[PDB]
Amino acid sequence: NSLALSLTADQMVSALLDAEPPILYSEYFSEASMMGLLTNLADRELVHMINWAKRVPGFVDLTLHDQVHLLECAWLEILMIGLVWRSMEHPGKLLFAPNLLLDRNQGKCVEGMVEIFDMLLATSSRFRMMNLQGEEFVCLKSIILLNSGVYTDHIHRVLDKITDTLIHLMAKAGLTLQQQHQRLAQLLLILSHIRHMSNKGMEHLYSMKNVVPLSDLLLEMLDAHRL
């Protein structure tokens, strides 16, 4: 049995909020300059993401192989939804780091990046245009981790519990029954687009492996998407 299932929604939320990775800083614009700062930033976020996943209810219960599979499938999605979350307060911009603000014009400095930026900007705006709460964000990011790679019963039961947790939060906000499953649907349909942004962005990572030297861990994270 899993300890994850025994939790209530409030302490499921409390667990997710406490497991949150920190917002890292970048170093204090061309193709190599852009890829250089992002590769370094993303690489440091992976280490935090790994330890974050280990504190996600139900994740430890899985085998080490399954933990590797899910992280390999979802790592870019998780970084992207983290990006659009903190980019909310800054419409038209992408808060990659507190000291690294990138508008659309700098996305053109990297071939095939500017169009992914637009999808990121539209995702952040969509999250803004409907008041995405932090308690909802941590639930969404956890769903992405467990649902990513999952089609290779426990994960499904944990996913159902996260679903209950989301409804639990919307019920707190004073939404009606119709508004609860409507908002629930709205949030999950966005995850489909985050999957789209990831895949489209992952194939570009192949066409960028040369420009700047990628780290070993990074090379291995994207090489997994080629099998």
């Binding site: 280490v47 790994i50 996943a53 280990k54 080490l64 933990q67 590797v68 992280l71 390999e72 070993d216 861990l217 291995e220 994270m221």
Partner: peptide, 9 residues
């Protein structure tokens, strides 16, 4: 032997 194996411990 991937790095992800080690970091997850």
């Amino acid at each position: 032997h991937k790095i992800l194996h080690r970091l997850l411990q």
